[PDB]
From a paper:
To identify all the zinc coordination sites, we next crystallized PEDF in the presence of this metal and collected X-ray diffraction data. Crystals were obtained in two space groups, P21212 and P212121, with one and five protein molecules in the asymmetric unit. In both cases, the crystals gave diffraction data up to ~2 Å. Zinc binding sites were identified in both space groups: 1 site for P21212 and 7 sites for P212121. Importantly, all identified sites were located at the intermolecular interfaces and included coordinators from two or three protein molecules confirming the role of zinc as a promoter of PEDF oligomerization observed in DLS studies. Two of the binging sites (#4 and #7) have lower occupancy, which might correlate with their affinity for zinc. In addition, collagen recognition may be affected by the occupancy of site #4, as in this case the dimerization interface prevents access to the collagen binding site. However, complete blockage of ECM attachment can be expected upon filling of type 2, 3 and 5 sites, as they contain Asp256 and Asp258, or Asp 300, which are directly involved in collagen binding. Considering the incomplete occupancy of binding sites in PEDF crystal, the described configuration of zinc binding is consistent with the average stoichiometry of 3–4 observed in biophysical studies.
Numbering used by the authors: 42 to 418
The structure:
């Protein structure tokens, strides 16, 4: 009566926080109609889950409902969270993801909050000093350490009015299971919309083995390419050239993506994929204020952290994402029984598309992009 996959606690928690991530993606995309969207919401959800350790029942419950924990009956959801983080940030996954809680200067933190925070989330609080330049330098150094320097350093100054600041950072550069032949990469058309076309570097595999399916309701075609480390990327490509992907965005949930994944079928296709090297640095404070989290910014109860009243004032996100032709090996070339019939398909990502990076074992959303322009911001 229940999908055995989502009965596994880590998989259920992955589904919950990834549903938070798809919600956040929808909010950001609705406010970015003409710009790329690039998010790794797991880091933001992790910052929020960690902060909930320091919250009393009311605020804790608000946070937990935003993270879809209300559908989970677990003895220790924070231990499950530690398991999930250890699984999806292992070396093979090529994903760096880090979360930080930053407190106003001179705040006195209870050790009873520091302890479970370190135990389950592997991070410790950072209390500001009041020197903007040194606080910015220290945050940049923390990001450099966590992301192996693969993210750009920030120049935005730390505001003076900060009670609680959450920081979520993520970087991904993966390796396809099946490399692209760099000799076939060339400049090709990318249709930004019905009336605009640009030239972008485009990787090509004319005989690509991928998992495919066409959704006529959403009027789009879906392809799945595996990556090393037991991950995959699922592309949603509209059938007509358009920047309007809202109907596709509305359907994205952990369970719906699991369904799509299960229903794709193996095929051979003429595949073109644009090279990607994207970055993002921004504030998601207002998006969260729109996501039933407003109470964190007025008068929440974080008395498990400190006796002085504190509140959320800022939530920052920095993300970097990259794929090129790099891959593990070439097509397997296995022995086959003779067959007469082929079923040719074309999958050309030469127009705005959405992509979702997912961990195969847990189903966790690790990265999501609306690519209106592969060249970047
Ligand atoms: Zn024949």
């Amino acid at each position: 009566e229940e999908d055995p996959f989502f009965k596994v606690p880590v998989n259920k928690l992955a589904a919950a926080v990834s549903n938070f991530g798809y919600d956040l993606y929808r909010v950001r995309s609705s406010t970015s109609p003409t710009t790329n969207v690039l998010l790794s919401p797991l880091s933001v959800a992790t910052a929020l889950s960690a902060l909930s350790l320091g919250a009393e029942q009311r605020t804790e419950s608000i946070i937990h409902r935003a993270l879809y924990y209300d559908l989970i009956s677990s003895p220790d959801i924070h231990g499950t969270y530690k398991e999930l983080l250890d699984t999806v940030t292992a070396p093979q996954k090529n994903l760096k993801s880090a979360s930080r809680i930053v407190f106003e200067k001179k705040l006195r933190i209870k050790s009873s909050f520091v302890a479970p925070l370190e135990k389950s989330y592997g991070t410790r609080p950072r209390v500001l000093t009041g020197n903007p330049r040194l606080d910015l330098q220290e945050i940049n150094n923390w990001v450099q350490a966590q992301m192996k320097g693969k993210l750009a350093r920030s120049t935005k100054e730390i505001p003076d009015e900060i009670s609680i600041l959450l920081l979520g950072v993520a970087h991904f550069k993966g390796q396809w299971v099946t490399k692209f032949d760099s000799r076939k990469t060339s400049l090709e058309d990318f249709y930004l919309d019905e009336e605009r076309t640009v030239r972008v570097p485009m990787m090509s595999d004319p005989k690509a083995v991928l998992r495919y399916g066409l959704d006529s309701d959403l009027s789009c075609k879906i392809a799945q390419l595996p990556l090393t480390g037991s991950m995959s990327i699922i592309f949603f490509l509209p059938l007509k050239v358009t920047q309007n992907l809202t109907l596709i965005e509305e359907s994205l949930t952990s369970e719906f993506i699991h369904d799509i994944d299960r229903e794709l079928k193996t095929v051979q296709a003429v595949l073109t994929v644009p090279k990607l090297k994207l970055s993002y640095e921004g504030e998601v404070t207002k998006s969260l204020q729109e996501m039933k989290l407003q109470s964190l910014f007025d008068s929440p109860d974080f008395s498990k952290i400190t006796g002085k009243p504190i509140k959320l004032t800022q939530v920052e996100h920095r993300a970097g994402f990259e794929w090129n032709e790099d891959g593990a090996g070439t097509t397997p070339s296995p022995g086959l029984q003779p067959a007469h019939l082929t079923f040719p398909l074309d999958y050309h990502l030469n127009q705005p598309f959405i992509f979702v990076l997912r961990d195969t074992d847990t189903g966790a959303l690790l990265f999501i992009g609306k690519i209106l322009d592969p060249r970047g911001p």
